[PDB]
């Protein structure tokens, strides 16, 4: 004869979603994630605990893509609107020392903008990139956002540079971290520790290559929701890294005008030196070895008597067909066809990728808003790491074995999903019962 015994403080878990808070070691991330991190991070290894993780259902990703949006919108809120500069522009071509490729890329536009007083306008001359200016019908033009959204200038002293971000469980919750080096994002993990805060994640935003992430511990890992479904993306994590050097070679003399009462507008103004194309440099040998490693790991899922072909994007908007990247605050749209033009079968020699620059960005894909990225004075250079790829299997039931992959991607959640895959949020519910031989006195 057994009796019910009640226990409180019982180590029992349920899956949960909660409002995790941010912590971090004139930057926006630093301002928002004001809460300090542990001075001495700790984890508790849990012996004999097996739990299932599911990267594709990780609600930490969904929270990260909710707070990052909020942070950008709050950061751009107390800034100058450029709606007074949605005026008819009078534009001619920039013909001053133009190299090829760049011919017709920049236009010299002039317009009448408002000033401190409502009774006066100022004639302004400024260079614009072609992507930001469209013809109305030398000729009359308008900014690309004039018929769809208000344009807001990002504040020139605000830094959006990613810094490490740590997500922390609120009391009553815990985060389980998977230490299994072979973990493919889905299923049971047998080497689990409990932490209060995650590994720092850098909130990098990009579209085809994943930049400045974590590296795989032992081998390149192909992670996907499914293998068969060609509507799903493949997140490829590299073990080694590929360095990419991104430069905008043009020099700039950035000038400012008061648009209104204490409201300053920044504009490109002129360009010093030759007008040249922005480029991104990837070492060819490093890239070919990296891609070969990816190919071998893909063979494990598709067959090892196959042909693996890479191709560029099938088409669509610039934001998807090219590799979007934020360099020093400038917005780059890099052409990756030079990286994915190849077929694999069973001095330095770098690869140069041309890149476009765009100042008006429909950031986070909201049709009703756009931001103006002010120009940066001088020459811009960034050096960053390719830590992963987003591939799309092209599909087709041809049974030819010629699987084809493209640098599709274009999603914004995938960039963090590939980093937060090791974590799960669990709610602790420390109350339960079990039989014993003890009856309470009555």
């Amino acid at each position: 004869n057994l009796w019910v015994t009640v226990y409180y403080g019982v180590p029992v878990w349920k899956d949960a979603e909660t409002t995790l808070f941010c912590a971090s070691d004139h930057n926006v991330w630093a301002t928002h994630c004001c809460v300090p991190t542990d001075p001495n991070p700790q984890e508790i290894h849990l012996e004999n605990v097996t739990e299932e993780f599911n990267m594709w259902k990780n609600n930490m990703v969904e929270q990260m893509h909710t707070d990052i949006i909020s942070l950008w919108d709050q950061s751009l809120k107390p800034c100058v609107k450029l709606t007074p500069l949605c005026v008819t522009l009078q534009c001619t071509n920039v013909t001053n020392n133009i190299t090829d490729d760049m011919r017709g890329e920049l236009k010299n536009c002039s317009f009448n903008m408002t000033t401190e007083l409502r009774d006066k306008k100022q004639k302004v001359y400024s260079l614009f990139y072609r992507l930001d200016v469209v013809q109305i019908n030398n000729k009359e033009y308008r900014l690309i956002n004039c018929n769809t959204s208000a344009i807001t200038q990002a504040c020139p002293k605000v830094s959006f540079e990613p810094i490490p971000i740590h997500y922390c469980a609120p009391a009553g919750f815990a985060i389980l971290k998977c230490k299994d080096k072979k973990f493919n994002g889905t299923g049971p993990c047998t080497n689990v520790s409990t932490v209060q805060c995650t590994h720092g994640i850098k909130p990098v935003v990009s579209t085809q290559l994943l930049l400045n992430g974590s590296l795989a511990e032992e081998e390149v890992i192909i992670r996907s929701e499914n293998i068969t479904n060609n509507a799903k993306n493949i997140l490829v994590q590299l073990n080694e890294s590929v360095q990419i050097n991104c430069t905008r070679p043009n020099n700039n003399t950035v000038k400012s005008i008061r648009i209104g009462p204490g409201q300053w507008f920044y504009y490109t103004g002129d360009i010093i030196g030759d007008i040249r194309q922005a480029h991104c440099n990837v070492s060819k040998a490093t890239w070919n070895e990296t891609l070969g490693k990816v190919v071998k790991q893909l063979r494990k899922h598709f067959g090892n008597n196959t042909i693996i072909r890479f191709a560029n994007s099938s088409g669509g908007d610039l934001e998807v067909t090219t590799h979007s990247f934020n360099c020093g605050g400038e917005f780059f749209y890099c052409n990756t066809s030079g990286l994915f033009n190849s077929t694999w079968i069973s001095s330095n020699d770098s690869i140069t990728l041309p890149c476009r620059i765009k100042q008006i960005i429909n950031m986070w894909q909201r049709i009703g808003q756009a931001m103006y990225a002010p120009p940066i004075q001088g020459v811009i250079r960034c050096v960053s790491n390719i830590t992963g790829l987003i591939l799309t299997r092209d599909g087709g039931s041809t049974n030819s074995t010629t699987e084809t992959f493209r640098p599709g991607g274009g999603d914004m959640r995938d960039n963090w999903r590939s980093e937060l895959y090791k974590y799960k949020v669990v709610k602790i519910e420390p109350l339960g019962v079990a039989p014993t031989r003890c009856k309470r006195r009555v």
Binding site: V4, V6, V10, V35, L46, P170, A171, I428
Partner: protein
């Protein structure tokens, strides 16, 4: 073992860490707030960004409500002052017909909770009724003294 360090340990072994998990919800709430209150521009962010500020209040109110929920259940069952409590309700073989020596030696609390998950509501109802009857009996015994 530390917080939840007993999660994979047997049910028996885990009884010695009940104070570790039990105290964690409120000491957790308080320590996190003590760090937020250092105000390295946090008090200003917390109150200025009203959207963020209510997300934090929402998290804290909810954590408190769960603490109280469990404490009230223990109160109703006559178990509020202890981490380990015996009651006056017999164990049903229909909930689990596993041997007592298996339950406290060859199995963990996570496994057990799954094993009897569907009986949680009935067990709790039985505990509430038994305790009310016992309190009435004591009151009547005093009246009869």
């Amino acid at each position: 073992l530390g917080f939840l360090g007993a999660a994979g340990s047997t049910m028996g072994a885990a009884s010695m860490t009940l104070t570790v998990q039990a105290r964690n919800l409120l000491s957790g709430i308080v320590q996190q707030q003590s760090n937020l209150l250092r105000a390295p521009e946090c008090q200003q962010h917390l109150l200025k960004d009203t959207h963020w500020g209510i997300k934090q209040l929402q998290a804290r109110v909810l954590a408190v409500e769960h603490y109280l929920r469990d404490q009230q259940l223990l109160g109703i069952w006559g178990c509020s002052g202890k981490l380990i409590c015996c009651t006056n309700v017999p164990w049903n073989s229909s909930w689990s017909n596993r041997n007592l020596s298996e339950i406290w030696d060859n199995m963990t609390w996570l496994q057990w909770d799954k094993e009897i998950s569907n009986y949680t509501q009935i067990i709790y109802g039985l505990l509430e009724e038994s305790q009310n009857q016992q309190e009435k009996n004591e009151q009547d015994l005093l009246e009869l003294d």
